[PDB]
Design a binder for this molecule. Structure first.
Ligand SMILES: *[C@@](C)(CO)[C@](*)(O)[C@H](CC(C)C)NC(=O)[C@H](Cc1ccccc1)NC(=O)[C@H](CC(C)C)NC(=O)[C@H](CCc1ccccc1)NC(=O)CN1CCOCC1
Ligand SMILES: *[C@@](C)(CO)[C@](*)(O)[C@H](CC(C)C)NC(=O)[C@H](Cc1ccccc1)NC(=O)[C@H](CC(C)C)NC(=O)[C@H](CCc1ccccc1)NC(=O)CN1CCOCC1
Ligand SMILES: *[C@@](C)(CO)[C@](*)(O)[C@H](CC(C)C)NC(=O)[C@H](Cc1ccccc1)NC(=O)[C@H](CC(C)C)NC(=O)[C@H](CCc1ccccc1)NC(=O)CN1CCOCC1
Ligand SMILES: [Cl-]
Ligand SMILES: [Mg+2]
Ligand SMILES: [Mg+2]
Lengths: 233, 212, 222, 222, 195, 196, 125, 204, 195
C-alpha cells in the first residue's frame, strides 16, 4: 500500500503512417506545489523504443534503472545485441507489464501509468499502455491522466480507427500532439508549459526533442471578461 | 437454495432444488446440487457454489483413495468427517457450505450426516439445509412418518422442495430426486417446477393462495 | 487505500449448436466514463479447438487466459500430445480460479468448443471456480440484458404452441450457425443501445470440427 | 451529460446531447436537455435530471410573472441571479449544473451556474461529464468574431466530442440559436449520427404463443 | 412479542398469538394476550417493539370505538384495515415510527364473509387466506400452502392451526409458551380456552 | 487562488490571478476575482467561488442601501459588513476576502478577512493558496508610499512567483487601480509575466 | 542435519545394515505367536541370567497398542519402545478421524511402513 | 435495507398501432419470503392507467393519492384527466417530496381521448419524466426488461401481436429476477375498449 | 450448545447437558449428547462455539486415552482437569482460540471421592460442589445455594437437578429441548434414559 508523493501528469501519444509519436511535460509536482521543473518523463530504450511514464516519480526512477539494466543484461553473451537480437518495444512492454501486475498482486504497486511507444523490427508501429493495476490496452491514440479526457478526443479526430493511420503523416500527427499539449496547459492544474516530444519512425529512426514550449496561446479575450454576471467595470 | 434428506423405513430420500443466485439475479435454474461420490454415497450442496462444488468433488477423491488403500468402501461417518475436518481447518477464512453426506454401508446402515462450514457435524434422521430450509421443514415435518412407502416418501421429498421453491425467492428451477437403498443410490429424475407446480396444484388441490 | 481491482466493462456471449459453438464478445475496453480502446480483443483461441474469454477486470482476465493457454501447452508435454477435451479444460480452469479463492480473479469466464462426441459445448465459470455446461450463457456488464433474451430465443422459455391452451411447450431444437449469429448480433446491438460500457465492435469466434473461424461487426461508438 | 454554450457575432448558441443515464443503463436515448426559461432565454442542464427540470421551470415561471409585472422583456442576468440564489440556498443538494444563455434589451449573454451557486462568464463554456472532451474541442477551434454558422458548427462539434468519447453522453445533438433582433430557433435533433441499424431478425411472435389464464373487459367509462 | 398467526376459513377468521413476554434472559410472563377487540366483529393481533405494540393497539381501539359511538354503526373490516394502514403509513415517516406488525381478523356482516388482513409496520396491507408475522411465516406459509383449503370449517381450521403450532414448537429456537386462539365470525369474537 | 492588495502613495491597487479549479481541472482560466462592492471599494475573493460571490453580492446590496441613506461609506464600513457576514456564518463559509478602497480623507486602505471572520487592517495583504510561496518575497520587497509603477511591478512580480509555484493559481494577472483619478483595470498575460 | 546414507546396496545386491538388524533380532529373546479358533496367544522368553529383578516395574515384553491389539517383539528393547509409541499414537489418530479403531492389518501395515522408512532415509539406521 | 428492493416487482409498458399495453407481475414479498401473489401494481383513473413498482406501502399510498387528486380534477374541470396532464401531476407530486421521496418507479400509460394518440411515460422516484415512443420499464428486473424490450420490440404492432411481445418481455425478465414473478397481468388498451389478461407463468 | 450443569453429591457427580442444536431460526437436532468419556471414571461436558466444542472434546479424549494405554493406568480427575486447563490456557493466546467451556465430572478411585471441575475457555479452573456454564448459572446457582446439601444421595441429587431443569424451562427464553443426564461414580459412567 502506497501513496504517490512527487508526481508526473499526462503522457500522450498516437500512431501515424510510418511510426509513433509520444510526449510528456517536464514537471514533478509535489501535491499542489509545482516542485521540480527539469524532470524528463520520456525514457528511450535503444534506438527504437520510448517509454513514457506518469505518476509517482520515485517509482519512475526505479523503472528507469530496470530498463537500463535490461539493456545491459540483453547485451550479455549476445553477438547480435545491436542487430537481430536487439530489444524490441514488445519485449520491453511485456517485461514492464509483468512487473506492474506482479507488484499489484503483492499489494505493493508501482504507482504509475506507462505508455510504451516504438517501432518493431518488421516496421510495425507499437503503442501500448500499462498501469499500476497491471491493466493493458492498445489503441491508435493513447493517453494517461487528464490526457485521456482531453487529448484523446482531439487525437481521435485525426486517427479515429486503424484505416486512418496510413492516411496520417508525421507533420499532421505532430501538430495534433503539440496542440493537445497546449490544451492540457490551459486546463490541467498540475501541468507545465515546458515539455519533451519523441518520434520513432521506421525510416528516420528515433528523434528526441527536448525543451519544447507551448505557444500560440489565446489569452487576449480575458480582458473583456468582467465580474461574474452583473458587473460592468 | 433448498436441500433435504430424510431417513425412513425404505432407506433414504434425498431431494434438492436447482437454482443458483447472485444476489437477486437468478444466475441458473439447472445446477446439480447432488454430488455422486460413489454408488453408495451422495453429498448435497448448499451455500457458496464453488466452495461446495470444489470440496465435495475433492471429498470424492479422498473416498476413492480410502478404498484403494483399505480395499473397502469408506463409511458415511468417515466420509463426512474428512469433509468436516477439512472445513474446520478453514474456519474463519469465510467458506460457506451447508452439506449433507447421505449413504449406506453394511456396518452403519442408512445414515445421514449434516456438515457445515463452521465445523458442525451431526448425525440425524431428518435435515433441511439452505435459504428455504424452513419452508421444506414445514411440509416435511407435518407429513413425515417412519412407515412411509418408497412411493410416498419420494413424493413428500419432492413436494417439500416444491413448497420451498414457491415461497423462498432464492430457491426454484427444478427438483432432483434420489433414493438410497441397501443396493445403492437410485436417481428418480429431474422435475421442472414450471410444470410440476400446476400438476401438483390440480391433482392435489393445494396452493389455493395462487390464482388458478 | 490501494484498491487492487478495477472494472474494464464489456460483455461476452456463448451459444452452442449441434456441431458448432460460438463465443462472442464486444471489443470495447473502458475505465469509469472513459474509453481505453475501441478494439481490444478478449476472446482468444487457446488451442485444441477451445475458445476462451474472461470478462470483468482485464488484468485478471489476461492473467487467467495466459495461464490456461500455458496449461494447454504443458498438458501436451506431459501426456504425449493428447488433445485436451473441453470437459477437462473446464475442470482445469476451476482449479486455476479456486487456487486464488482468497484473492479471486474478478472475472466471468466462458469457454466454448466441441465435446468428445463432436457436439457443441459452452461452459461458464464464476470468479472462484464454480462451473456448469450450458447451451447458452451471457457474461459481463450487459449479461442481465442479454441473458433473458437468450432464454426466450435459444431455449424457447415461456413460449407455448399456439392454440394448445398453454399446455404444449414449443419444442427444443438446435439452431443453425446462421440463426445463432443473427441472435448474437441482435443481442449486442440491443445491449449497445441500453448499456454505456458496451459498443464499438463485435468479434465472434465460431468453432467447428474444421477449426476456429472469426467474424467482426461494427457496433455503435457512442 | 455534455452541454456547451458558444457566443457569436449577433448572439449566442447553446447545445446538448440527448442521453439520460441510470447507473450504467441508458434510460432515455432522446431526452431534451435544452429548456425555455423565457422566449429568448434558454438553458442547457446537466446533473440530477429532476433538479435541472424543476429549477428551470420554477425560475421560468417567476420570470414570466416578473415580465408581466414590469411590462418588460426579461433579462438573462435576472434568471442568472434567481437561479444562483436558489441553488446557493440549498447548499448544492439541488444538483443542477446549468449553462444559461439568451438575448434581451441589454444584449446577448452567456453564463454557467453550478449546483452550489457559483456563476461564471465566458465566450465559450461546457458543463457535464463530457465537458472535458467538449472543452478540448472548444479550446482547439474557438476564435473571436465567430459567425452564426461557425458557432453552430463549433458547438455541435464540441457536443460530438462528448457523444463519442464520454460514456455519460450519446445519441443526438440538440441546438438552440438566440440571435439579436430575431426569434430564438430551437433545433431539436439538429444532428442524429447514432441511428439504430436494421435488426437481423423480426421477433414478432406467432399469435397464441403466450399462455393465458383469464380474460376480462375493463370498464373505463362512468 | 414474536408469533402471531391468522387463518381465514369458510365462515370465520382464526387468530393465534404467542403468550410469552421475554426481556433479556427472563420470561417475564407466559399468559399475555397480544390482541385487542376493535369492534364486536373485528379483532387485531399485534407484535413488534416493546411498548409500541400495546400503545398502538389501544390507540387504534379507542379511535374505532369513538367512530362506533358517533355513527351508531360498526365499520367494516376493510374500512378498519384501511384506517390502520394509513396510521402506520403516517408513522413510518415520523420522528419515531411505531414498530408494530398487525393482523386484522374480521367478519363483514353486510357481505357475510370473513376477512383477514396482514399489515406490517411500514403500512404494507394485503388481504390473505392465511397470514403470519415475524419468523413464524418461514414455517407456516409452506405448511398452509399444502394443507389449506378455502372451504374448510372452523374446526378444520383449528386442526390446521394446531399443525402450525406443533411445527413451530418443534423447529423454533425460542420458547414462546403456547398460543391464545380466538375466533371471529357472524356471532362476534370468542376465545378458545383449551389449546 | 493567489490574491493581494497593496496601498501606495496615490491610493491602493488590488491584484489577482484568474484560475478557478475543480480538483486539478481548471473550470475557468479567465476568472475575475476582483469585484466591485462600491464605486471605489473593491475586494479580492479567495476560497469557495459560491460563498465569496454570495457574500460580495450581499455586501454590494448593503453598501448601496447605505449610500441611499447616509452617502458614501468608508472602506472600514465595507470591511465591517464583510466581517459581520463571515464571522456570524463562520461554520458554513469558506471565504478568504481582502477588502480594499479609496477615501479622499483616508486615502488607500486594505483590510484582510481570513476564514475565522477576524478583521486586520494592513499596509498590504496577501491571501489564497499561492500566497504561501511569496511571504518571503513580499516582506523583503514591500515599501510604504511606493509609486503607481513600483506597486504594479511589486504585485506583478509577486503574483508571477505565486502562479509559478502554486498549481491552484494561473492564467492572467488582473489588477484594479483605486485612486482619486478614478478606477483603472489592468491585465497581464503569461508571455509577459512568466519570464520575469 | 546428519544426512549420511547408512543403509545402502552392496555389489551382491544386499543391504547389509538391514541384514545386520536381523542379526540383532536373532540375538533377542524368543517370542512366539499362536492363534487358535477364537483367540490368539503371545508367548515370550525372559532370560534367567538376571536375578534380583523387580518384575512389578520391569517393562513387560508384550505391549498394548489399543484395547483390542497387542504387540510383542524380539531384538533391541530400546528400539521397540519407539515403534510401540508411534503405533499407539496412530491408533488414537485413527479413532479420531475414521471414528473406528484400527484393524490389526492396518496397525501392522503402519508399523511396517515405519520400519521400511528407516531403511531408505538418510542419517538413520 | 434498500426500500426499492424489499417488496420486489416489475411494470412494463409498450405502444402499438392505435393502442397501448401495460403489464405487471403479482409478487409482494419481504425480501426472501414470498407473502402475496395477488398484489396488482397497475391502477387506473378514468382512461389513464398508472403502474407503480418499488416499496409497496408507497405504491398503495400513491394510488390513493392520485385517485384523490384525479377525482377533484374531474369535479372542477368537468372532464376526465388526459395522460399528458396526469404525467405532469405525477411529476409535480413526486418532486414535492424531493428530500423525503416515495420509493417508487411509476409508469403512466393511456390513449388521449381527443387526439387518439398512444402515450406512455416513466418516472424516477423524485419525478423526472421519461417519455418514450416505444417502451417504458420499471422495477427490480428493469435491466432484464430493458434487454427484452430492446430486442423484441418493433413499431406499429397490432393489439393482438403487441400482447404477445409485452407478455414475453415481462415473463422472461421476471424469470431471471428472484424478487419478481409469482403471476402477471397484462392490460391491452384500445381507443374505447380495454382487455385485461392474467398470464400463466412459473411460480418460483 | 447452551445449557450444561454439574452437581457433586456424597458418592457421585451428575452432569446434565441440553439436547438442542440450533443454527439460525431452526432447531436442527433435539437429541444431541454434549459430552465425551475421557476415561472410565471421568466425563467431560462442553458448550460454546460451533465446531470448536466437539473438535476440542475429541482432542482431549484422544490424549487421555493415549495416556491410559501408555501407562496402563487411569489418570485422576484432578490430573485430567489440570491437563484440560493447560490446553485452554495455551489456546486463549493462540491465533484462533478454542471458544469452549467445559465441566469435568469424575470419581477418584484412590481417594474414593467424586469431583466436579468447572473450566471456562480462558483456562479458568475451579473445583465446585455444583457448577454451570452460560446463562444457566444465573438461575441454578442461587437455587442450589438454597436446596443443596453436601451429604445428599444420587437420587436426592437427581431431584435437585430436576428442580433446576424445571426452573430453566420456566424462565429461559430459548427452547433447549430437555437434557441428557449422566452419573459418574465408583462403578463408572452411566446414562439416565428417562428424564
Ligand atoms: C441457494 C440458491 C442460495 O443459497 C443455494 O444455496 C445456492 C447453492 C448452489 C449454487 C450450490 N447458492 C448459491 O447459488 C450461491 C449463493 C451465494 C453466493 C455467494 C456467496 C454465498 C452464497 N451463489 C453463488 O455462489 C453464485 C453462483 C454463481 C452465480 C453461479 N456465485 C457468486 O455469487 C459469485 C461468487 C461469489 C463469491 C463467493 C466467494 C468468494 C468470492 C466470490 N459472485 C460473482 O460472480 C460476483 N458477481 C456476479 C454478478 O456480476 C457481478 C459480480
Ligand atoms: C449526463 C448524461 C450525466 O451522465 C447528464 O448530466 C444528465 C443530465 C440530463 C438527463 C438532465 N444526467 C443524468 O441523466 C442523471 C445522472 C445522474 C444520476 C444520478 C444522480 C445524479 C446524476 N440521471 C438522472 O438524473 C436519472 C434520470 C432518470 C433516468 C429519468 N435519475 C436517476 O438515476 C435517479 C437519481 C435520483 C436522485 C435522487 C436523489 C439524489 C440524486 C439523484 N436514480 C434512480 O431513479 C435510481 N433508483 C431506481 C430504483 O428506485 C430508487 C432510485
Ligand atoms: C484558489 C483556487 C485557492 O484558494 C482560489 O481561492 C479560488 C477562488 C476563486 C474561485 C474565487 N478558489 C476556487 O476556485 C475554488 C477552490 C475551492 C474548492 C473547494 C472549496 C473551497 C475552494 N473552487 C471552486 O469553488 C469550485 C468552483 C467550481 C469549479 C465552479 N467549486 C468546487 O470545487 C466545488 C466545491 C464545493 C464546495 C465544497 C466545500 C465548500 C464549499 C463548496 N466542488 C464541486 O463542484 C465538486 N463537483 C463534483 C461534481 O462535478 C462538478 C464539481
Ligand atoms: Cl468566481
Ligand atoms: Mg422461489
Ligand atoms: Mg500555476
Amino acid at each position: 500500500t502506497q501513496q504517490p508523493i512527487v508526481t508526473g501528469t499526462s503522457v500522450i501519444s498516437m500512431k501515424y503512417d510510418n511510426g509513433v509519436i509520444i510526449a510528456a511535460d517536464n514537471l514533478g509536482s509535489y501535491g499542489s506545489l509545482l516542485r521540480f521543473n527539469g524532470v524528463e518523463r520520456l525514457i528511450p530504450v535503444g534506438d527504437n523504443t520510448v517509454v513514457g511514464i506518469s505518476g509517482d516519480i520515485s517509482d519512475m526512477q526505479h523503472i528507469e534503472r530496470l530498463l537500463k539494466d535490461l539493456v545491459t543484461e540483453n547485451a550479455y553473451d549476445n553477438p547480435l545485441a545491436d542487430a537481430e537480437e536487439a530489444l524490441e518495444p514488445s519485449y520491453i512492454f511485456e517485461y514492464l507489464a509483468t512487473v506492474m501486475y506482479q507488484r499489484r498482486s503483492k499489494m505493493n504497486p508501482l504507482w504509475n501509468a506507462i505508455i510504451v511507444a516504438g517501432v518493431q523490427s518488421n516496421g510495425d508501429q507499437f503503442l501500448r499502455y500499462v498501469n499500476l493495476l497491471g491493466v493493458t490496452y492498445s489503441s491508435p491514440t493513447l493517453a494517461t491522466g487528464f490526457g485521456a479526457h482531453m487529448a484523446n478526443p482531439l487525437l481521435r479526430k485525426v486517427v479515429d480507427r486503424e484505416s486512418d493511420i496510413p492516411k496520417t503523416t508525421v507533420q499532421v500527427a505532430e501538430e495534433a500532439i503539440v496542440n493537445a499539449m497546449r490544451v492540457l496547459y490551459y486546463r490541467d492544474a498540475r501541468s507545465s508549459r515546458n515539455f519533451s516530444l519523441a518520434i520513432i519512425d521506421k525510416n528516420t529512426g528515433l528523434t528526441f526533442k527536448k525543451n519544447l514550449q507551448v505557444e500560440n496561446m489565446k489569452w487576449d479575450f480575458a480582458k473583456d471578461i468582467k465580474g461574474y454576471g452583473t458587473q460592468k467595470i | 437454495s433448498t436441500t433435504l434428506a430424510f431417513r425412513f423405513q425404505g432407506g433414504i430420500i434425498v431431494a434438492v432444488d436447482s437454482r443458483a443466485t447472485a444476489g437477486n439475479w437468478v444466475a441458473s435454474q439447472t445446477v446439480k446440487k447432488v454430488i455422486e461420490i460413489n454408488p453408495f454415497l451422495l453429498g448435497t450442496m448448499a451455500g457458496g457454489a464453488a466452495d461446495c462444488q470444489f470440496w465435495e468433488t475433492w471429498l470424492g477423491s479422498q473416498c476413492r483413495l480410502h478404498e484403494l488403500r483399505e480395499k473397502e468402501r469408506i463409511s458415511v461417518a468417515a466420509a463426512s468427517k474428512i469433509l468436516s475436518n477439512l472445513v474446520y481447518q478453514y474456519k474463519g477464512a469465510g467458506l460457506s457450505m451447508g452439506t449433507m453426506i447421505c449413504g449406506y454401508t453394511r456396518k452403519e446402515g442408512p445414515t445421514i450426516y449434516y456438515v457445515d462450514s463452521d465445523g458442525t457435524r451431526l448425525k440425524g434422521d431428518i435435515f433441511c439445509v439452505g435459504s428455504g430450509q424452513t419452508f421444506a421443514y414445514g411440509v416435511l415435518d407435518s407429513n413425515y412418518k417412519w412407515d412411509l412407502s418408497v412411493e410416498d416418501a419420494l413424493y413428500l421429498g419432492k413436494r417439500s422442495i416444491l413448497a420451498a421453491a414457491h415461497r423462498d425467492a432464492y430457491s426454484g428451477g427444478s427438483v432432483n430426486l434420489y433414493h438410497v437403498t441397501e443396493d445403492g443410490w437410485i436417481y428418480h429424475g429431474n422435475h421442472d417446477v414450471g410444470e410440476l407446480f400446476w400438476k401438483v396444484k390440480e391433482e392435489e388441490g393445494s396452493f389455493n393462495n395462487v390464482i388458478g | 487505500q490501494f484498491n487492487p481491482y478495477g472494472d474494464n466493462g464489456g460483455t461476452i456471449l456463448g451459444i452452442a449448436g449441434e456441431d458448432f459453438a460460438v463465443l462472442a464478445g464486444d471489443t470495447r475496453n473502458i475505465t469509469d466514463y472513459s474509453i481505453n480502446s475501441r478494439y481490444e480483443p478478449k476472446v482468444f483461441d487457446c488451442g485444441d479447438n477451445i475458445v476462451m474469454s474472461a470478462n470483468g477486470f482485464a488484468a485478471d482476465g489476461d492473467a487467467l487466459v495466459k495461464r490456461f493457454k500455458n496449461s494447454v501447452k504443458w498438458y501436451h508435454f506431459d501426456h504425449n500430445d493428447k488433445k485436451l477435451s473441453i470437459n477437462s479444460a473446464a475442470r482445469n480452469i476451476q482449479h486455476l480460479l479456486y487456487g486464488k479463492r482468497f484473492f479471486p480473479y474478478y472475472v466471468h469466464t466462458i469457454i466454448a468448443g466441441l465435446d468428445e462426441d463432436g457436439k457443441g459445448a459452452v461452459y461458464s465459470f464464476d470468479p472462484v471456480g464454480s462451473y456448469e455446461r450450458e447451451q447458452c450463457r451471457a457474461g459481463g456488464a450487459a449479461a442481465s440484458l442479454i441473458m433473458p433474451f437468450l432464454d426466450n430465443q435459444v431455449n424457447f422459455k415461456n413460449q407455448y404452441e399456439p392454440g394448445t391452451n398453454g399446455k404444449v411447450k414449443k419444442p427444443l431444437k438446435y439452431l443453425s450457425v446462421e440463426e445463432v449469429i443473427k441472435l448474437v448480433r441482435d443481442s449486442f446491438t440491443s445491449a449497445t443501445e441500453r448499456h454505456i460500457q458496451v459498443g464499438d465492435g463485435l468479434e465472434i469466434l465460431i468453432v467447428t470440427k474444421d477449426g476456429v473461424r472469426k467474424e467482426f461487426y461494427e457496433l455503435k461508438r457512442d | 451529460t455534455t452541454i456547451v454554450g458558444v457566443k457569436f457575432n449577433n448572439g449566442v448558441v447553446i447545445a446538448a446531447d440527448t442521453r439520460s443515464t441510470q447507473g450504467p443503463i441508458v434510460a432515455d436515448k432522446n431526452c431534451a436537455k435544452l429548456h425555455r426559461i423565457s422566449p429568448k432565454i434558454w438553458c442547457a442542464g446537466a446533473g440530477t435530471a429532476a433538479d435541472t427540470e424543476a429549477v428551470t421551470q420554477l425560475i421560468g415561471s417567476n420570470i414570466e410573472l416578473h415580465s408581466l409585472y414590469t411590462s418588460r422583456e426579461p433579462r438573462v442576468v435576472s434568471a442568472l441571479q434567481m437561479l444562483k440564489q436558489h441553488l446557493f440556498k440549498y447548499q448544492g443538494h439541488i444538483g443542477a449544473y446549468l449553462i444559461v444563455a439568451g438575448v434581451d434589451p441589454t444584449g446577448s449573454h452567456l453564463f454557467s451556474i453550478h449546483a452550489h451557486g457559483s456563476t461564471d462568464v465566458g465566450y465559450y463554456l461546457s458543463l457535464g461529464s463530457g465537458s472535458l472532451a467538449a472543452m478540448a474541442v472548444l479550446e482547439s477551434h474557438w476564435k473571436q468574431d465567430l459567425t452564426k454558422e461557425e458557432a453552430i458548427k463549433l458547438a455541435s462539434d464540441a457536443i460530438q466530442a462528448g457523444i463519442w468519447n464520454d460514456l455519460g453522453s450519446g445519441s443526438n445533438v440538440d441546438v438552440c440559436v438566440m440571435e439579436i433582433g430575431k426569434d430564438a430557433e430551437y433545433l431539436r435533433n439538429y444532428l442524429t449520427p447514432n441511428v439504430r441499424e436494421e435488426k437481423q431478425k423480426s421477433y414478432k411472435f406467432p399469435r397464441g404463443t403466450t399462455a393465458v389464464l383469464k380474460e376480462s373487459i375493463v370498464n373505463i367509462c362512468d | 412479542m414474536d408469533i402471531i398467526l391468522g387463518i381465514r376459513v369458510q365462515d370465520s377468521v382464526i387468530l393465534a398469538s404467542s403468550k410469552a413476554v421475554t426481556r433479556g434472559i427472563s420470561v417475564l410472563k407466559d399468559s399475555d394476550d397480544k390482541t385487542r377487540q376493535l369492534s364486536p366483529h373485528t379483532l387485531m393481533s399485534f407484535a413488534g417493539e416493546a411498548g409500541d405494540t400495546v400503545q398502538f393497539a389501544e390507540y387504534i381501539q379507542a379511535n374505532i370505538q369513538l367512530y362506533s359511538i358517533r355513527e351508531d354503526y360498526e365499520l367494516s373490516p376493510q374500512a378498519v384495515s384501511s384506517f390502520v394502514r394509513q396510521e402506520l403509513a403516517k408513522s413510518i415517516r415520523s420522528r419515531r415510527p411505531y414498530q408494530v406488525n398487525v393482523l386484522i381478523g374480521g367478519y363483514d356482516k353486510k357481505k357475510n364473509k370473513p376477512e383477514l388482513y396482514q399489515i406490517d409496520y411500514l403500512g404494507t396491507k394485503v388481504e390473505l387466506p392465511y397470514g403470519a408475522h415475524g419468523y413464524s411465516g418461514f414455517y407456516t406459509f409452506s405448511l398452509l400452502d399444502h394443507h389449506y383449503r378455502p372451504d374448510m370449517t372452523t374446526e378444520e381450521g383449528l386442526d390446521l392451526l394446531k399443525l402450525c403450532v406443533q411445527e413451530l414448537e418443534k423447529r423454533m429456537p425460542m420458547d414462546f409458551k403456547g398460543v391464545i386462539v380466538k375466533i371471529v365470525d357472524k356471532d362476534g369474537i370468542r376465545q378458545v380456552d383449551d389449546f | 487562488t493567489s490574491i493581494m492588495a497593496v496601498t501606495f502613495k496615490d491610493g491602493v491597487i488590488l491584484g489577482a490571478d484568474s484560475r478557478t479549479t475543480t480538483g486539478a481541472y481548471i473550470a475557468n482560466r479567465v476568472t475575475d476575482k476582483l469585484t466591485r462592492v462600491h464605486d471605489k471599494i473593491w475586494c479580492c475573493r479567495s476560497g469557495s467561488a459560491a460563498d465569496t460571490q454570495a457574500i460580495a453580492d450581499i455586501v454590494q446590496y448593503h453598501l448601496e442601501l447605505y449610500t441611499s441613506q447616509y452617502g458614501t461609506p468608508s472602506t472600514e464600513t465595507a470591511a465591517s459588513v464583510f466581517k459581520e457576514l463571515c464571522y456570524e456564518n463562520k461554520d458554513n463559509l469558506t471565504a478568504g476576502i481582502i477588502v480594499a478602497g479609496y477615501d479622499d480623507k483616508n486615502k488607500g486602505e486594505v483590510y484582510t478577512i481570513p476564514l475565522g471572520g477576524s478583521v486586520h487592517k494592513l499596509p498590504y495583504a496577501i491571501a489564497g493558496s499561492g500566497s504561501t510561496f511569496i511571504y518571503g518575497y513580499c516582506d523583503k520587497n514591500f515599501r510604504e508610499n511606493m509609486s503607481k509603477e513600483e506597486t504594479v511591478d511589486f504585485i506583478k512580480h509577486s503574483l508571477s512567483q505565486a502562479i509559478k509555484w502554486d498549481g491552484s493559481s494561473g492564467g492572467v494577472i488582473r489588477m484594479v487601480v483605486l485612486t482619486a483619478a478614478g478606477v483603472e483595470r489592468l491585465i497581464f498575460y503569461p508571455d509577459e509575466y512568466e519570464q520575469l | 542435519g546428519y544426512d549420511r546414507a547408512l543403509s545402502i546396496f552392496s555389489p551382491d545386491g544386499h543391504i547389509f545394515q538391514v541384514e545386520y538388524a536381523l542379526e540383532a533380532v536373532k540375538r533377542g529373546t524368543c517370542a512366539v505367536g499362536v492363534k487358535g479358533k477364537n483367540c490368539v496367544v503371545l508367548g515370550c522368553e525372559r532370560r534367567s541370567t538376571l536375578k534380583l529383578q523387580d518384575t512389578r516395574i520391569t517393562p513387560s515384553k508384550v505391549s498394548k497398542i489399543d484395547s483390542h491389539v497387542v504387540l510383542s517383539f524380539s531384538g533391541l528393547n530400546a528400539d521397540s519402545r519407539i515403534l510401540i509409541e508411534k503405533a499407539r499414537v496412530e491408533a488414537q489418530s485413527h479413532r479420531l478421524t475414521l471414528e473406528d479403531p484400527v484393524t490389526v492389518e492396518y496397525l501392522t501395515r503402519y508399523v511396517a511402513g515405519v520400519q521400511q522408512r528407516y531403511t531408505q532415509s538418510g542419517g538413520v539406521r | 435495507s434498500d426500500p426499492s428492493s424489499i417488496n420486489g416487482g416489475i411494470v412494463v409498458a409498450m405502444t402499438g398501432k392505435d393502442c397501448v399495453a401495460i403489464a405487471c407481475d403479482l409478487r409482494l414479498g419481504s425480501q426472501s419470503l414470498g407473502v402475496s401473489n395477488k398484489f396488482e401494481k397497475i391502477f387506473h383513473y378514468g382512461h389513464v392507467f398508472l403502474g407503480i413498482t418499488g416499496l409497496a406501502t408507497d405504491v398503495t399510498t400513491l394510488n390513493e393519492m392520485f385517485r384523490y387528486k384525479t377525482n377533484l380534477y374531474k369535479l372542477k374541470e368537468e372532464r376526465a384527466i388526459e395522460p399528458e396532464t396526469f404525467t405532469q401531476l405525477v411529476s409535480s407530486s413526486l418532486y414535492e417530496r424531493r428530500f423525503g421521496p416515495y420509493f417508487v418507479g411509476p409508469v403512466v400509460a393511456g390513449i388521449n381521448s381527443k387526439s387518439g394518440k398512444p402515450f406512455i411515460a416513466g418516472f424516477d422516484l423524485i419525478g423526472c419524466i421519461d417519455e418514450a415512443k416505444d417502451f417504458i420499464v420499471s422495477g427490480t428486473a428493469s435491466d432484464q426488461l430493458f434487454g427484452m424490450c430492446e430486442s423484441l420490440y418493433e413499431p406499429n404492432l397490432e393489439p393482438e401481436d403487441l400482447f404477445e411481445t409485452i407478455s414475453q418481455a415481462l415473463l422472461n425478465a421476471a424469470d431471471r429476477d428472484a424478487l419478481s414473478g409469482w403471476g402477471a397481468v397484462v392490460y391491452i388498451i384500445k381507443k374505447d375498449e380495454v382487455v385485461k389478461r392474467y398470464l400463466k407463468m412459473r411460480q418460483d
